[PDB]
Design a protein around this ligand. Structure first.
Ligand SMILES: Cc1cc2nc3c(=O)[nH]c(=O)nc-3n(C[C@H](O)[C@H](O)[C@H](O)COP(=O)(O)O)c2cc1C
Ligand code: SF4
Ligand code: SF4
Ligand code: SF4
Ligand code: FES
Ligand code: FES
Ligand SMILES: [Ca+2]
Lengths: 905, 148, 156
């Protein structure tokens, strides 16, 4: 299309509206109610431009640029006097009731309303009357509510209800008393309620965890990191002040997690700021815990390891690729053990084999929203991979999108699209042991044990393709539901099958692979998504190694007299008694970790490793994309006694001190080169980010904004002399404002978004090639593998149906977004949000055992009797007891295990 | 009308099924706007909708919907019973047919009459409303309600 | 502790039979609860939401958007006087002053005995007979400030 803005000709996309087209050209139009991910509604009336009928026209007409298509031969003006006057008047009308609150408001310096008040040029107040006032509500531990600052732009309700599918936030009231919030005081129930603090252009919804230790945006030190709380790998901007991690903001990635995070990633960072974290290397001598610096710790550990006869290393999916590879190099390839159990490793390797050898294209997180039918097998996506559940909701609304596009309704006219596609939606079929949070939009839900869900998947694959193995013993009603699912999936242009390792069953993954292969054999555009558990579970699966049971066997048998545990608590993947006995039998335990774990009481040496905020590295997310995360701040800048290094740096220095009796720490690119040279499967991690010599016209990339303050006073209480600026030899970023953060800089890693006049998260519009699209020079992250030329064979291992045996109870896994991830429960703001530790019982089984709801029952697992209160679960099948995975005392390895002597105490 | 066969199923044997309902509102002026009327009919807050698309293409519950005033649908049966030629010859004006006009507010006869289009406002005030009341002198007038 | 009566639920479901979407019966469900109870209490929002299958936030937004759905307690009789333009020309202000003098309350308030609640309302569509008021279901026209005490005594 051809448009003419202020007499200047531009080529745009005709399917776009004028606001996003002009913002993609770099032109500045103020806007409040429009969002790139939410569409246009024409509410705030801020984006007014003046449209002319043709080339010669002097009158014009004030039109709404978000509601006006950028058709061919359009003529508009932004800097027209009437348009500028009306935009200033709209800002003035919004500012009539706005409270005098900017000094004590957490959106100050980050406020879109502040930016657009300044940008319209409105600074003189002629309104002399009163301002309307609203009482506030308690929205939970994460979101702070202040309704006085609202401009009634309707972004919160649109996102939370239409986009995120939430049901507890709405708009109430009338003419100028419109209230945006919950119908009563209570926690916001949605798993994506944290994105309200970026969706809201004002300070109505604010990050309360950030508000506890608040600092302004210009005072932050930012880095581009990867969220470490599940396997999705959402791009984040951690921001730091005064030596503590202060906030997690959403960093735009047009391929993964474009504008939105989930609440676990946005509020689960608080384990970084814990005061019990190790800050120095500590050696246990008898009962004393003496403190070493880095060199003496390296020398002593190297000496003791040199006297040992066999040193084994236990990695973890918490640690990055470089840390796991450095441990593997230190202990040897045959002595390296992955930190997960045998069953977890088997499921992880099967999911990896399906992903990179099944011949079916695994989509990115943004690409999930374009699939025409979704089948989720076994995985509770909202509690394990929540952003995938959000993308599934968008893919479900794709049917209404298609129905409106068939009537020549523009794709940004979201209200007309929702009116046309009233309740018609793409088919979603979810299977779980109980109800899921996707059930409000799912076409069907199957509450059944994991064997029965696997049998349902195998039956779907057999009904789609007769060469697939069949399932005998299907009820006629279940067969009717099976053929409903099959007719929905076969008629879909782009079917998507989502499974994962969290179901605790190999057969569920096999059934999902069979369904994907059967859909591929019919010529469909099938995609498959596998949800892993931890941040680098795919990386540890690709690198591979022995299971934790083999490492414990080597420690118990005495064949290994030294164990190096890297970033692992060892209790989520094995029984605590066995781990404690094996570690007590080992004459040397050496734990390299950044969180105070329970296995350090018997550890002979403890290395204070760095968390993701204080380390650089690479992680592989669930889709097989390698992504680099960068250090946010130097932990030794404020406390000079703090010796906290990267895990790969620690282990490479230990290997050097063991071999040549000398200390060499590393550079990060050296470890990256070692990984891509010795492991050809991980050879794609080199292109995840450029090396430390990458420059933008000769200068590095700035971590903090150019108006970063307090440089000569923030450390003045320790010493009046300003210290050396910290040197970052590992990466291309500098720990200072002396760098480049231009929107037009030829780079992909953006630590934070800021443009002059755009201080809010709307500066990402300046950082993109087109608004709502990708980054200008591509998104960071490179897929490790392409899709295979040939697929796998059908999995013939069809399990039998679940038989409830007497005296035993099958443990059904229950996952929580707040509580199941290991590092997130350590965050003290999560204890107000994590549910009470329950045990889920079927009503028939609870009546058989004579237990009501809330009474305490005691069960013994691995000879350890623990007691939990009973919650009645209607959807849980009998013979199963439901346990909350990843909580205190309940390892996630317990999924699918049998429970004995479950009896009321 | 339902018990006499004018409504329901098979009206006058032609096979056309028509069901008529009465939906009482809950007191809001914006509900008279036809897109806000549709939104209120759907049980939502009566915020209007951006047009295009118009309600005739996708209106109530996404279906073709026609919103019309009471007086238009009261003018319809006379057109269908007496013909187009009669209705076009009621008045010699651009606006065809009769309109319910009337003057209100401190007049001798505040009321409502049916007059052909093109009737001047002085005739409605003087010949029909009786003019202004005793002791009151005419100052201004609004032709079509509070929004004029 | 709010529960819906059998008659209320049957009337709500019969209203739900009239529409192709159960959401379209929210206004009539709120009006049914209001007719049975005088006003719509806090638990009625969740009860109507559970019966209708829509979120409670939608029911609360509908109940707070419409002026004739009362989310606050009212008296046994609701006086609604018109303060629009034609009744302002016809002098509604004397009627409002007489109502405030007799009831000893301001508009939007309830009397001490819970008998009357005074409310301004928009135009009642009775402008040729103004000034107009509407007590609970009856609309009274041709109002004079002297007829207000006699008119209010017939609503016990
Ligand atoms: C704010 C507003 C309020 C309206 N209220 C009414 C109303 O109460 N009754 C009505 O018939 N039309 C009302 N209308 C006009 C309608 O939009 C629409 O024109 C009419 O209901 C049907 O069109 P018709 O004149 O062809 O019958 C209103 C319009 C606006 C903008
Ligand atoms: S929301 Fe924005 S304009 Fe309002 S007080 Fe906060 S910073 Fe100031
Ligand atoms: S609370 Fe925020 S997002 Fe919601 S309408 Fe008000 S300003 Fe917009
Ligand atoms: S979906 Fe996973 S990776 Fe993304 S923000 Fe949530 S916890 Fe982090
Ligand atoms: S951005 Fe267009 S009216 Fe709000
Ligand atoms: S102005 Fe009062 S009834 Fe119309
Ligand atoms: Ca570093």
């Amino acid at each position: 299309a051809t448009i003419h803005v202020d007499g200047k000709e531009y080529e745009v996309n005709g399917a776009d509206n004028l606001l996003e087209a002009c913002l993609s050209l770099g032109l500045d139009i103020p806007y409040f109610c429009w969002h790139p991910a939410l569409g246009s509604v024409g509410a705030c009336r801020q984006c007014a431009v003046k449209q002319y009928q043709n080339a010669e026209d002097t009158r014009g007409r004030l039109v709404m640029s978000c509601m006006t298509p950028a058709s061919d031969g359009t003529f508009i003006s932004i800097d027209d006097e009437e348009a500028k006057q009306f935009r200033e008047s709209v800002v003035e009308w919004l500012m009539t009731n706005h409270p005098h609150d900017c000094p004590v408001c957490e959106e100050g310096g980050n406020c879109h309303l502040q930016d657009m008040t300044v940008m319209t040029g409105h600074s003189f107040r002629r309104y002399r009357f009163t301002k309307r006032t609203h009482r506030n509500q308690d929205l939970g531990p994460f979101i702070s509510h202040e309704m006085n600052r609202c401009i009634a732009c309707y972004r919160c309700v649109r996102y939370y209800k239409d986009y995120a599918g939430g049901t507890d936030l709405g708009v109430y009231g009338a003419h100028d008393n419109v209230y945006f919030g919950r119908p009563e005081d209570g926690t916001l129930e949605s798993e994506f309620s944290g994105n309200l603090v970026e969706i809201c252009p004002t300070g109505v919804f604010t990050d309360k965890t950030h508000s506890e230790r608040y600092n302004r945006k210009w005072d932050m030190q930012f880095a581009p990191s990867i969220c470490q709380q599940c396997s999705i790998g959402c791009n984040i901007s951690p921001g730091e002040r005064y030596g503590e991690l202060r906030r997690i903001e959403n960093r735009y990635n047009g391929t993964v997690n474009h504008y939105f995070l989930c609440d676990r990633g946005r509020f689960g960072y608080g384990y970084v700021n814990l005061k019990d974290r190790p800050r120095q290397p500590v050696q246990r001598r008898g009962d004393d815990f003496i403190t070493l610096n880095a060199e003496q710790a390296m020398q002593g550990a190297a000496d003791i390891l040199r006297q040992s006869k066999k040193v084994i290393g236990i990695g973890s999916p918490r640690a990055s690729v470089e840390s796991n590879f450095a441990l593997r190099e230190l202990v040897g390839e045959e002595n390296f053990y992955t930190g997960i159990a045998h069953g977890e490793q088997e499921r992880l390797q099967l999911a990896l084999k399906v992903l990179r050898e099944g011949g079916i294209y695994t989509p990115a997180l943004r690409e999930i929203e374009s699939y025409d039918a979704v089948l989720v097998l076994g995985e509770d996506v909202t509690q394990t991979g929540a952003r995938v559940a959000l993308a599934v909701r968008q893919a479900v609304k794709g049917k209404a999108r298609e129905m409106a596009a068939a009537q020549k309704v523009a794709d940004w006219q979201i209200a007309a699209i929702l009116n046309i596609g009233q309740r018609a939606k793409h088919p979603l079929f979810v299977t779980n042991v109980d109800d899921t949070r996707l059930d409000d939009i799912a076409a069907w839900t199957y509450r059944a044990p994991v064997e029965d869900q696997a049998r349902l998947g195998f039956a779907i694959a057999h009904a789609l393709d007769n060469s697939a193995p069949a399932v005998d013993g299907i009820e006629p009603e279940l067969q009717s539901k099976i053929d409903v699912i099959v007719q929905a999936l076969a008629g879909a242009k782009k079917p998507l099958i989502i499974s994962g390792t969290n179901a605790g069953s190999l057969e569920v993954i096999q059934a999902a692979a069979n369904v994907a292969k059967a859909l591929k054999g019919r010529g469909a555009d099938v995609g498959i998504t596998m949800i892993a558990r931890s941040v680098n579970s795919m990386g540890l699966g690709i690198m591979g190694g022995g299971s934790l049971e083999e490492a414990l066997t080597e420690l118990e048998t005495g064949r290994a007299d030294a164990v190096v545990v890297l970033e692992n608590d060892l209790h989520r993947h094995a029984s605590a008694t066995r781990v404690n006995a094996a570690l007590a039998k080992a004459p040397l335990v050496m734990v390299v970790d950044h969180q105070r774990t329970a296995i350090m009481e018997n550890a002979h040496l403890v290395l204070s490793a760095a968390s993701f905020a204080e380390s650089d590295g690479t992680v592989i997310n669930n889709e097989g994309r390698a992504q680099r995360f960068f250090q946010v701040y130097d932990p030794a800048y404020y406390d000079s006694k703090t010796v906290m290094l990267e895990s790969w740096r620690w282990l490479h220095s230990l290997h050097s001190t063991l071999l040549s009796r000398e200390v060499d720490w590393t550079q990060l690119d050296h470890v990256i080169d070692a990984v891509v040279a010795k492991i050809p499967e991980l050879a794609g991690i080199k292109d995840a980010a450029p090396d430390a010599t990458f420059r933008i016209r000769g200068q590095k990339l700035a971590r903090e904004p150019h108006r970063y303050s307090g440089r000569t006073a923030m450390r003045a209480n320790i010493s009046v002399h300003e210290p050396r600026q910290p040197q970052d030899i590992d990466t291309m970023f500098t720990f200072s404002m002396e760098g480049n953060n231009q929107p037009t800089a030829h780079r992909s890693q953006v630590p934070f978004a800021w443009a002059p006049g755009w201080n809010s998260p709307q500066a990402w519009n300046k950082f993109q090639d087109e608004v709502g699209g990708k980054l200008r020079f591509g998104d960071p992250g490179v897929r490790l593998f392409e899709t295979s030329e040939n697929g796998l064979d059908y999995f013939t291992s069809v399990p039998a149906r679940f038989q409830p045996q007497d005296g035993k109870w099958r443990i059904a896994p229950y996952y929580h977004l707040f509580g199941s991830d290991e590092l997130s429960q350590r965050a003290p703001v999560f204890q107000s949000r994590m549910p009470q530790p329950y045990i889920k019982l079927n009503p028939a089984d609870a009546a058989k055992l004579g237990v009501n709801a809330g009474t305490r029952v005691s069960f013994s697992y691995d000879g350890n009797t623990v007691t939990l209160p009973v919650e009645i679960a209607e959807g849980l099948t009998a013979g199963q007891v439901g346990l909350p995975m990843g909580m205190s005392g309940i390892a996630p390895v317990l999924a699918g295990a049998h429970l004995e002597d479950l009896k009321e105490a | 009308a339902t018990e006499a066969g004018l409504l329901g199923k098979n009206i006058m044997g032609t096979g056309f099924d028509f069901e008529l309902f009465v939906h009482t509102g809950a007191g809001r002026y914006i509900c008279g706007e036809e897109t806000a009327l549709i939104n209120s009919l759907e049980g939502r807050r009566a915020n209007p909708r951006s047009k295009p698309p118009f309600p005739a293409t996708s209106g109530a519950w996404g279906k073709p919907t026609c919103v019309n005033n009471v007086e238009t649908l009261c003018n319809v049966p006379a057109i269908l019973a007496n013909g187009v030629e009669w209705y076009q010859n009621i008045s010699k004006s651009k606006d065809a047919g009769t309109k319910l006009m009337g003057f209100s507010g401190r007049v001798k006869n505040p009321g409502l009459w049916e007059l052909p289009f093109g009737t001047t406002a002085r005739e409605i005030l003087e010949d029909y409303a009786g003019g202004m009341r005793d002791g009151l002198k005419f100052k201004a007038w609004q032709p079509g309600g509070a929004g004029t | 502790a709010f529960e819906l009566s059998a008659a209320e639920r049957e009337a709500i479901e019969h209203e739900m039979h009239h529409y192709e979407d159960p959401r379209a019966a929210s206004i009539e469900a709120l009006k049914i609860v209001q007719k049975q109870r005088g006003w719509v209490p806090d638990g009625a929002i969740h009860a109507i939401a559970d019966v209708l299958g829509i979120p409670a936030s939608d029911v609360e937004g509908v109940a707070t958007f419409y002026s004739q759905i009362f989310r606050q307690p009212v008296g046994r009789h609701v006086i609604r006087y018109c303060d629009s333009v034609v009744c302002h020309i016809n002098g509604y202000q004397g009627i409002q002053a007489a109502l405030e003098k007799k009831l000893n309350i301001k508009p939007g308030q309830t009397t001490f005995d819970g008998r009357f609640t005074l409310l301004p309302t928009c135009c009642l569509g009775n402008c040729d007979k103004g000034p107009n008021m509407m007590i609970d279901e009856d609309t009274h026209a041709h109002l004079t400030p002297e007829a207000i005490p006699e008119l209010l005594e017939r609503y016990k």
